[PDB]
Motif scaffolding. Structure first.
Motif, short mmCIF file in Angstrom:
data_model
loop_
_atom_site.label_atom_id
_atom_site.label_comp_id
_atom_site.label_asym_id
_atom_site.label_seq_id
_atom_site.Cartn_x
_atom_site.Cartn_y
_atom_site.Cartn_z
N UNK B 120 0.82 -1.21 0.00
CA UNK B 120 0.00 0.00 0.00
C UNK B 120 0.85 1.24 0.00
N UNK B 121 0.42 2.23 -0.79
CA UNK B 121 0.99 3.56 -0.71
C UNK B 121 -0.12 4.42 -0.15
N UNK B 122 -0.02 4.59 1.17
CA UNK B 122 -1.07 5.16 2.00
C UNK B 122 -0.67 6.51 2.58
N UNK B 123 0.53 7.00 2.27
CA UNK B 123 1.11 8.12 2.99
C UNK B 123 0.59 9.44 2.40
N UNK B 124 0.16 10.32 3.28
CA UNK B 124 -0.25 11.66 2.91
C UNK B 124 0.82 12.67 3.23
N UNK B 125 0.52 13.93 2.90
CA UNK B 125 1.35 15.03 3.35
C UNK B 125 1.48 14.94 4.84
N UNK B 126 2.68 15.26 5.32
CA UNK B 126 3.04 15.09 6.72
C UNK B 126 2.79 13.69 7.22
N UNK B 127 2.95 12.71 6.32
CA UNK B 127 2.68 11.28 6.55
C UNK B 127 1.21 10.94 6.74
N UNK B 128 0.56 11.59 7.70
CA UNK B 128 -0.73 11.07 8.19
C UNK B 128 -1.95 11.85 7.69
N UNK B 129 -1.77 12.93 6.93
CA UNK B 129 -2.92 13.55 6.25
C UNK B 129 -3.59 12.50 5.35
N UNK B 130 -4.93 12.58 5.28
CA UNK B 130 -5.86 11.59 4.65
C UNK B 130 -6.35 10.49 5.60
N UNK B 131 -5.55 10.16 6.61
CA UNK B 131 -5.83 9.13 7.60
C UNK B 131 -6.02 7.76 6.98
N UNK B 132 -5.30 7.48 5.89
CA UNK B 132 -5.46 6.22 5.18
C UNK B 132 -4.83 5.05 5.94
N UNK B 133 -3.83 5.32 6.78
CA UNK B 133 -3.14 4.24 7.51
C UNK B 133 -4.10 3.29 8.25
N UNK B 134 -5.14 3.83 8.88
CA UNK B 134 -6.07 2.97 9.63
C UNK B 134 -6.75 1.94 8.71
N UNK B 135 -6.97 2.29 7.44
CA UNK B 135 -7.50 1.35 6.45
C UNK B 135 -6.52 0.21 6.15
N UNK B 136 -5.24 0.55 6.03
CA UNK B 136 -4.19 -0.46 5.81
C UNK B 136 -4.11 -1.40 7.03
N UNK B 137 -4.20 -0.82 8.22
CA UNK B 137 -4.15 -1.61 9.45
C UNK B 137 -5.39 -2.48 9.59
N UNK B 138 -6.55 -1.93 9.23
CA UNK B 138 -7.81 -2.70 9.16
C UNK B 138 -7.68 -3.93 8.25
N UNK B 139 -7.09 -3.72 7.07
CA UNK B 139 -6.84 -4.82 6.13
C UNK B 139 -5.82 -5.84 6.65
N UNK B 140 -4.78 -5.36 7.35
CA UNK B 140 -3.80 -6.25 8.00
C UNK B 140 -4.47 -7.22 8.97
N UNK B 141 -5.30 -6.68 9.85
CA UNK B 141 -5.95 -7.46 10.88
C UNK B 141 -6.89 -8.53 10.30
N UNK B 142 -7.62 -8.15 9.26
CA UNK B 142 -8.66 -8.98 8.67
C UNK B 142 -8.16 -9.95 7.61
N UNK B 143 -7.18 -9.56 6.81
CA UNK B 143 -6.83 -10.32 5.61
C UNK B 143 -5.41 -10.84 5.54
N UNK B 144 -4.48 -10.30 6.33
CA UNK B 144 -3.09 -10.73 6.25
C UNK B 144 -2.88 -11.94 7.14
N UNK B 145 -2.32 -13.01 6.57
CA UNK B 145 -1.97 -14.22 7.32
C UNK B 145 -0.92 -13.92 8.39
N UNK B 146 -0.93 -14.72 9.47
CA UNK B 146 0.07 -14.58 10.54
C UNK B 146 1.46 -14.76 9.92
N UNK B 147 2.39 -13.86 10.25
CA UNK B 147 3.72 -13.84 9.60
C UNK B 147 3.76 -13.24 8.20
N UNK B 148 2.66 -12.63 7.75
CA UNK B 148 2.57 -12.05 6.40
C UNK B 148 3.43 -10.81 6.21
N UNK B 149 3.73 -10.51 4.95
CA UNK B 149 4.59 -9.39 4.56
C UNK B 149 3.76 -8.10 4.41
#
Ligand SMILES: Nc1ncnc2c1ncn2[C@@H]1O[C@H](CSCC[C@H](N)C(=O)O)[C@@H](O)[C@H]1O
Ligand SMILES: Nc1ncnc2c1ncn2[C@@H]1O[C@H](CSCC[C@H](N)C(=O)O)[C@@H](O)[C@H]1O
Ligand SMILES: *CCC(=O)Nc1cccc(-c2c[nH]cc2CN(C)CCN)c1
Ligand SMILES: C=CC(=O)Nc1cccc(-c2c[nH]cc2CN(C)CCN)c1
Lengths: 337, 337
Positions: B120-149
Motif C-alpha cells: 500500500x501507498x497510504x502516505x499523505x502530506x506530513x505522513x498522516x494527512x488523509x488518515x489512510x493508515x487505519x484502512x491499511x491496518x484494518x486490512x492487515x488485521x482482517x486479511x493478512x496471514x500470521x507472519x505475512x509481509x
C-alpha cells in the motif's frame, strides 16, 4: 445560496490578503505600464484631481501624486485600504492622497475629478466584473471631458496547441519506458479529465503554442455610451483564421490589451503570449479532445464573454467553432475557481 | 465547519482520487514509484507464487509490479471510481487472470482467501494527512496471514527548525518596491508577516539544505505490526524533540517529513527529506506567528503531536509546543491546508 452582500464580502476579503497584491506589484509589465501611462499624462494630471478606483495598497494613487496631481481619492472596498493609508502616510503624502474606505459606488468625494485611474482587469479581461464599478464612477464622479486611464481594451482569440497539456496527455504512453507497465490506454481518460470539463483554464503559453494569426474579436472604448448594457448582454463576435502547420489543436486562447492615451504616444499593456509574461497569463478554452490540424486548416467561430447567471463576478464564455471539415460545435465555459 | 456526514466525507475523498491529475503526479514521482517497484521486486522470494492485497490500488500500478515479481494472485482493492481505470490497465497488460480489481473500501470488500502480503501507498502530506493508515491496518488485521509481509513495514517522522529562504524573499519584497517603482512600501513587512506566518495552516512546500537550521530529529516511529497502533493514531502520535541551531538566522518555524522502510537484499528507504531527492510530498511546514532570531547553539525544543482533526478525521492536525532559547514556551495548533 450566495447573496449580493455575501458575494461582495467574499470578493473583497480575497483582496485583503498580501499574496494577491504581491503578485500584482511583482508584475513589472503591469505595474510599469501604469507608472509610465500615468507619467506620460502629466499635462492632464498636474494640479488636477484623480479618483483611483480600487486603490489596493495605494500604489497607482501615489504614481498620480508623483505626476503632480493636486489631490487623489484612493477608494478601496477591501480591508487593504488600511495598508494603503499606512503607505500614503509612510511616503509623506497624507495631504495629497486621501484613502477612502468602501465601494466606489457609495463613496462620497468632496468634488468631481479631472481623471480616473484603475487597474480593473481580471482573467480573460472581464472576470471579476470590475469594469461596471469603473463606469459607475465615471458617470457619477468624472467631469465632462476628464481623463480615463486606461481608456480602452481589446480582446483577441487564436487556436492553440498547449505544449504542457500535450506532455500531460502523452505521459501515459511514456509509463512503459519509465516503469515497464503499459498505461497508454489511460490516454482517453486523461483527455476526458483535462479537456472534457467546461472550465476556463488560466495558463501562460508561448508563441510556439499559437497556431494562427491572432484575431481581435472585441474592442471596448470605455467612454462609449451603452457599454454597461453591452457587458450585461455579452461582448464578442465572430472570428476566422488559417493554421500554420501540423499540430494537435487543443482549443483557443484569449487575451487582452488595454491602451493609455499618449502625452508623447499611446502606451499599450499587453497580455499576449508573444509578449512578456504577466500575471494574467492567457485564458484557455479547451475542446473536449484534440483535433489534428494542418497548414491552411480553416478555423472559424464565434465567442461571447458574459457574467455567469448565479455569480455576476464569474466570467462565462460561450463558444461556437468549426475546425476544417469537422461539423460546427459549441462549448459553454465558466472561470475556474 | 460546514457539517458533512461520514459517508459524504468519504465520498468526497474518493471522488478526488477519480481524477487523473493526482495519479499522474504520483506515477511521475520517480523516487516514490521506483522505491515501491524495487521494494516489491527485492521481495520476490516472499511473493513468488503467493497472494497479495494492494490497499488502494488506484490505477493498478503497484499490483502489476507485484504480478511482475511472480505473485500468483493480486487483489487490487480501490474505493474510488479510478478502479475502472485499474481494471482496463490490467486487461491491457494481459494480467486479468492474476490481478483482480475489486471496487469499494477495503473495510467492506470480500476476498476469497487471506493473503500472504499487503502492499500500500497510504502516505499523505506530513505522513498522516488523509488518515489512510487505519484502512491499511484494518486490512492487515482482517486479511493478512500470521507472519505475512507488509510493504512498506514501518514509518518514521522527523522535525527540524527552518529558515525558509523563499518566505524570507516574500517578506522582503515590500522593502524592494522603492527600487523598482519609487514608492516605499517597506512598512507593509508587518502585514505580510501576519498574512504569511500568522495563520494556522500547515504549508506543504519543497525546501533544501539551505533552509535547515539544525540536525533533524526523529520524533516518532510507527511499526505497522505493533498492536494498538490504530488506537495511537486516534489519540495522536508524536513526541518531544530538541536540537541546537547551527548559526545566525531568522527562524520561521519547523519542517516535518517522513520516510518509510521496505524489508530487503538489504532494506529500502523511501525518504521525503529536504536533503534527499525531491518527491511530490515535499515537506510540511509549521510556521511561527513571526520570525525569531536564532544564533549558533540556540536551543530549540518542544513536543509535537499529529492527530485527526475533530470535524474532518481525514484532515491532519498538528499540536505543537516549542521553546526557542530563553523566549517563553509557546504553542500553536495547525490544520492541513
Ligand atoms: N467597487 C469597488 N470599489 C472599491 N474598490 C474595489 C471595487 N471593486 C474592486 N475593488 C478593488 O479594486 C482592486 C483591484 S486590483 C488593483 C489594486 C491596485 N490599484 C494596484 O494596481 O495594485 C482590489 O483591491 C479590489 O478590492
Ligand atoms: N479505505 C480504502 N479502501 C480502498 N481504497 C482506498 C481507501 N482509502 C484510500 N484508498 C485509495 O488508495 C489510493 C491511495 S494513492 C496510491 C495509488 C496507487 N496504489 C499508486 O501507488 O499509484 C487512492 O486511489 C485512494 O482512493
Ligand atoms: C483525493 C483525496 C485527497 O484529498 N487526497 C490528497 C490530498 C492532498 C494531496 C494529495 C495528492 C496530490 N498529489 C498526489 C497526492 C497523493 N499523495 C499525497 C500520495 C497518497 N498516497 C491527495
Ligand atoms: C476576489 C477575487 O477572487 N479576485 C481575483 C480572482 C482571481 C485572480 C486574482 C488575482 C490573482 N493574482 C492577482 C490577481 C488580481 N489580478 C487579476 C488583477 C486584478 N485587477 C484575483
Amino acid at each position: 445560496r450566495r447573496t449580493k452582500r455575501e458575494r461582495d464580502q467574499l470578493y473583497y476579503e480575497c483582496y485583503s490578503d498580501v499574496s494577491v497584491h504581491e503578485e500584482m506589484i511583482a508584475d513589472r509589465v503591469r505595474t510599469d505600464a501604469y507608472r509610465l501611462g500615468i507619467l506620460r499624462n502629466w499635462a492632464a494630471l498636474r494640479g488636477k484631481t484623480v479618483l483611483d478606483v480600487g486603490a489596493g495598497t495605494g500604489i497607482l494613487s501615489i504614481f498620480c501624486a508623483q505626476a503632480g496631481a493636486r489631490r487623489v481619492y484612493a477608494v478601496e472596498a477591501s480591508a487593504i485600504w488600511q495598508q494603503a493609508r499606512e503607505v500614503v502616510r509612510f511616503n509623506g503624502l497624507e495631504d495629497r492622497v486621501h484613502v477612502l474606505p468602501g465601494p466606489v459606488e457609495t463613496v462620497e468625494l468632496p468634488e468631481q475629478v479631472d481623471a480616473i485611474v484603475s487597474e480593473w482587469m481580471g482573467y480573460g479581461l472581464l472576470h471579476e466584473s470590475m469594469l461596471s464599478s469603473v463606469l459607475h464612477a465615471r458617470t457619477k464622479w468624472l467631469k465632462e471631458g476628464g481623463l480615463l486611464l486606461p481608456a480602452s481594451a481589446e480582446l483577441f482569440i487564436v487556436p492553440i496547441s498547449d505544449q504542457m497539456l500535450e506532455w500531460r496527455l502523452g505521459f501515459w504512453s511514456q509509463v512503459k519506458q519509465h516503469y515497464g507497465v503499459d498505461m497508454s490506454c489511460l490516454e482517453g481518460f486523461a483527455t476526458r479529465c483535462l479537456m472534457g470539463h467546461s472550465e476556463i483554464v488560466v495558463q501562460g503559453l508561448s508563441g510556439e503554442d499559437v497556431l494562427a494569426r491572432p484575431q481581435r474579436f472585441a474592442q471596448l472604448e470605455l467612454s462609449r455610451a451603452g457599454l454597461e448594457q453591452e457587458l450585461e448582454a455579452g461582448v464578442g463576435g465572430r472570428f476566422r483564421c488559417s493554421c500554420y502547420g501540423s499540430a494537435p489543436m487543443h482549443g483557443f486562447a484569449i487575451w487582452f490589451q488595454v491602451t493609455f492615451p499618449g502625452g508623447e504616444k499611446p502606451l499599450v499593456l499587453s497580455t499576449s503570449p508573444f509578449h512578456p509574461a504577466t500575471h494574467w497569463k492567457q485564458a484557455l478554452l479547451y475542446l473536449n479532445e484534440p483535433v489534428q490540424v494542418e497548414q491552411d486548416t480553416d478555423v472559424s467561430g464565434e465567442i461571447t464573454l458574459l457574467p455567469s447567471r448565479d455569480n455576476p463576478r464569474r466570467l462565462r464564455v460561450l463558444l461556437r467553432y468549426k475546425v476544417g471539415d469537422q461539423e460546427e460545435k459549441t462549448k459553454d465555459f465558466a472561470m475556474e475557481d
